[PDB]
Amino acid sequence: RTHLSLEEKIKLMRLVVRHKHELVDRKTSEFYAKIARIGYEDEGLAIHTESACRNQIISIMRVYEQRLAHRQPGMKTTPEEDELDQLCDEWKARLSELQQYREKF
């Protein structure tokens, strides 16, 4: 139930995207455990359980969708916002890929 800083959210999403091809459909536990471990060991995140790590990512993505939906033409963005948006877009695409695979075949 902790709150990540923007910096920590970017560090976490960098890891999620770097390791995105390691997520196996219906084996989420192993993936979010690994992300929590590497985030702690390398990026100085606090110790998170698997569930707490997964919830942080769910929350980042939920806020991302809000930001996307409320984006206005001509708005100013920061480089950190741009990076997080790009990382979230890439993670969303991975999740959608796995969904499509499960549904279609």
Residue numbers in the entry: 29 to 133
Study authors write:
However, it has also been shown to bind Ter1 sites at the rDNA repeats where it stalls replication fork progression. The overall structure of the Sap1 DNA binding domain (DBD) reveals a bundle of four helices, with helices α1-α3 making up a single myb-type helix-turn-helix (HTH) domain. In our crystal structure we have identified a dimerization interface between Sap1 monomers that we predict to be engaged in the direct repeat binding mode.
Since molecular replacement was not an option due to lack of sequence homologs, we attempted to solve the structure by anomalous diffraction using selenomethionine labeling. Unexpectedly however, the structure solution was greatly facilitated by anomalous scattering originating from an arsenic adduct (dimethylarsinoyl) to Cys81, formed due to the cacodylate buffer used in the crystallization solution used in the PACT screen (25% w/v PEG 1500, 0.1 M PCTP pH 7.0 (propionic acid, cacodylate and bis-tris propane)). For comparison we also collected native data from crystals grown in 25% w/v PEG 1500 and 0.1 M SPG buffer pH 7.0 (succinic acid, sodium phosphate monobasic monohydrate, glycine). The two resulting structures were virtually identical, showing that the arsenic adduct did not induce structural changes in Sap1. The packing between the α1, α2 and α3 helix bundle is imperfect and forms a deep cavity. The structure was solved using a serendipitous arsenic adduct (dimethylarsenate) that bound to residue Cys81. This adduct did not alter the structure and shows that there is a cavity inside the Sap1 protein that can accommodate an organic molecule. However, the fact that cacodylic acid, which reacts normally with solvent-accessible cysteines, is found inside the cavity indicates that the pocket may be accessible from the solvent at least temporarily. We speculate that the cavity in Sap1 might play a role in a similar mechanism in S. pombe.
